[PDB]
Symmetry: C3
Subunit: 115 residues, 3 copies
């Protein structure tokens, strides 16, 4: 899976990676996938807006080959938002998460398709 965090909250690199490590653990747990398959990123975007304001906010795009369904989506939405709130101080009502399914024929690793 790939987890893209985009946020206007600035924290030091060690803290950023801490938050990602916890998000990686949640993804691994919920999707039943090893850490070996998980990409994550903390993208600091100073001009990011939500509801017409530059107040602290997070957007997460989570892309996975399978595992995108109501049960997993709900569980991860809860867990990821909690992590972001705790680690970044963001209000839960300023956290958006998008879930994307990708087919194995449309994803490559080490120069070859998964499918």
């Amino acid at each position: 899976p790939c987890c893209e965090l985009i946020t206007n909250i600035s924290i030091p690199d060690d803290k950023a990676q801490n938050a990602l490590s916890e998000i990686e653990d949640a993804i691994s747990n919920v999707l039943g996938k090893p850490v070996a398959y998980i990409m994550s990123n903390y993208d600091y975007q100073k001009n990011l807006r939500f509801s017409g304001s530059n107040e602290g906010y997070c957007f997460v795009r989570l892309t996975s080959i399978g595992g995108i369904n109501r049960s997993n989506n709900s569980s991860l939405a809860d867990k990821i938002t909690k992590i972001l709130s705790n680690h970044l101080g963001v209000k839960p009502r300023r956290v958006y998460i998008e879930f994307r399914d990708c087919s194995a024929q449309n994803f490559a690793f080490s120069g070859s398709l998964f499918g």
Copy 2:
């Protein structure tokens, strides 16, 4: 909705905000969705290329739960491209816009899915 502007054009933060604000209003006008539901971003990407060159360029990805259709896309393509040319000085022929539909079951806010 989410409106991601990716550009190699650099303007100060307040002016970046101003440009995004105008885009939000266009989105609100066309989709009928108030700014309360709209995320926007100005991502300065110095190495961004289009048509084989580093000339001033903008890519916009607009993701929305519904309202992705020919009439709405056509209207927003026109409006957003004009806003970018006005505020960033980008040539119309160096503006790409992608429209993405997303299901409510695949989108979460405040720790919960949008879908029932």
Copy 3:
């Protein structure tokens, strides 16, 4: 097409430009799309992680109006991974590539939707 490279590998601007140009040429060759239609980017993301670490890694998202299929995806996976390994020194095992199809009706250029309809 749009080719978004996201990486924690730092290289000089001119070298990033060189790498993107080669990726463009590969996309053009496989998909048949002119360079005139290709957007590309090198997004340096210092905290990008894969497999639990900040070790050298590349993620590429390639979006195109058509041309997304087994044969094209396979060929570009090979070509792009080789370019990245050559230019950035990334190991192939730390290169992910996602392929995305988009309808012409959902894509605009110069303020107008692509296609006729």
